Amino acid sequence: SDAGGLGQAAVDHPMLGAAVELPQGGMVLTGRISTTTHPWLADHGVGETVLFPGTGFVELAVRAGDEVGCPVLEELTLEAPLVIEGDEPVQLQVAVTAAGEDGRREVAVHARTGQRPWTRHAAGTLTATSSTPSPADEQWPPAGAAAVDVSGHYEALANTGYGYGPAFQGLKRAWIRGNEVFAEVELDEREAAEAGGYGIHPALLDAALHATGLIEQAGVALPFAWNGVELLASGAQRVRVHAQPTDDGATSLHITDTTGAPVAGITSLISRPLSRPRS
Amino acid sequence: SDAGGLGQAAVDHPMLGAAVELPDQGGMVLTGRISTTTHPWLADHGVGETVLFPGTGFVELAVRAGDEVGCPVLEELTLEAPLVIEGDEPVQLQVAVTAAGEDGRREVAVHARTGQRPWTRHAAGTLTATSSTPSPADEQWPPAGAAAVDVSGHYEALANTGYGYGPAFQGLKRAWIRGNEVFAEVELDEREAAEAGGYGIHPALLDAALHATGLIEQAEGVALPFAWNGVELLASGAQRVRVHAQPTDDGATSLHITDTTGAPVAGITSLISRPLPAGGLSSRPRSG
């Protein structure tokens, strides 16, 4: 009704607030973030530089898909980092094309501050074509997986270069079985309190990625290309994570809640680092 | 602001409240909403018992979107589909503006819908930044040689012809005729005068500026604005205006609008009206 009073459709999301139907046209969803209204934002980055997490673009792209009946995120490549400076407000736009005749829509995420030019930070494809989801869990912790000591894992990433403040220090337990890694990940109470409003809170899905850096440790490397991403259940505060390599050279991830019920499936996640590297 | 909290830009206008820049190489869309409850003058323009959004409202919408992209001049606008206002149901408005070409010209379109109906395009045209060199403010008012006209029965005549002009749209107060030219003074009712400052030009004021042109032709039948060319708004928020209408060689009318001190307000190079088919938008009258 805020949005409705402007002639648009209200969106009830912590980061997106209005939907603008274009008349073939497609659709645009808009929103505004900052470290005042999303304090967890200040806890993710590279050194002193803050970066909107890759998992936030996944959350945004899936939520736009929900609005057009295309919840499956078939593909998503991340292009430019979204540097957030201080408590500057950041305008967000998620642009969704009309459906092609193959059913697929293109999705894009743009952002800017002030009147500086918009920059495209994410681009991919949305569909309603769904893959059959991975079965639910049973035995936890999984049989034959050895418990790993992550007691000081966030310090190993603190001097490697990663910038994970308290909201993104989610990894609590991990195990290794062969090339598989298992993990328990949970939000702090502050982000836990907001979690119910998201598809999957961006800080929780990011921290679900942290245990993959246990099997093979490569400097700083961040999610880059996602493939076959489906959110299965919403509002999670704590999750279990099952990560495996693909023979495509990437990582599969199957996310469940504390009862083993599916939360999220990621068919493949490629990550990449980055003149001169850091140390 | 409201629009700011949604990640958009606010627009301060009575009918449009938000500007959404479309990054990519697309342009802009401005959005708003209207209803007889928030815009009571809507109820006072139509044909028969059918409330119709005034074509001048589309001129106002298109020009306001032009200002938002630094393209203030309405080079051309064609009205495509009438917009019926059904009771007090709200109407969603969208004004789409393209990226400028190499010419510096932008395409503009106005869409509307109520409830969950599909959008309908009501107006399409072209904005430019090119301004016309202004027309002379030469003032004896009224001009020499102009003969006063009794307009006391004018709106009663227009009613009998078929026009539906309620109180907010009965702004024609005085008129003079010289050759095939008409001069008019037009004033908003107090209710519309109070909100006129926020408009580029109140749609009810611009529409009544068109009422004096029928005094020469005395056309049988109802006709509504259809095509506009060279619409420049030179001064915003007028309540009372002077009007100078004359034909062009197109079968069209030009109009130059000044304020009550003779200063420029708006210029319309060409306006074409089109006859309304009996039985099109309201029922036909009953034969006698």
Numbering used by the authors:
A (entry chain B): 25 to 47, 49 to 243, 245 to 300, 307 to 311
B (entry chain A): 25 to 312
From the paper:
The dehydratase (DH) domain within type 1 modular PKSs is responsible for the dehydration of specific C-3 hydroxyacyl-acyl carrier protein (ACP) intermediates, resulting in a corresponding enoyl-ACP. Here, we present the crystal structures of the borrelidin DH domain from module 3 (BorA DH M3) and the fluvirucin B1 DH domain from module 1 (FluA DH M1) at 1.80 Å and 2.01 Å, respectively. Within each DH monomer, the substrate-binding cavity contains (1) a hydrophobic tunnel/phosphopantetheine (PPant)-binding region, (2) a catalytic region and (3) an acyl intermediate-binding region.
The fluvirucin B1 PKS utilizes amide-containing dipeptidyl intermediate 4, likely derived from l-aspartic acid and l-alanine. Unlike the BorA DH M3, all residues between α3 and β11 were modeled in the FluA DH M1. In silico docking of the alanine-protected dipeptide PPant intermediate 4 with the FluA DH M1 revealed key structural regions and residues that may play a role in substrate selection. Within the catalytic region, the C-3 hydroxyl group of 4 is in proximity and oriented toward the catalytic Asp 231. The gap identified between these polar residues with 4, the high B-factors associated within the invariant loop and the lack of modeled residues for similar type I DH domains suggest this structural region may adopt a distinct conformational change upon binding to the native substrate.
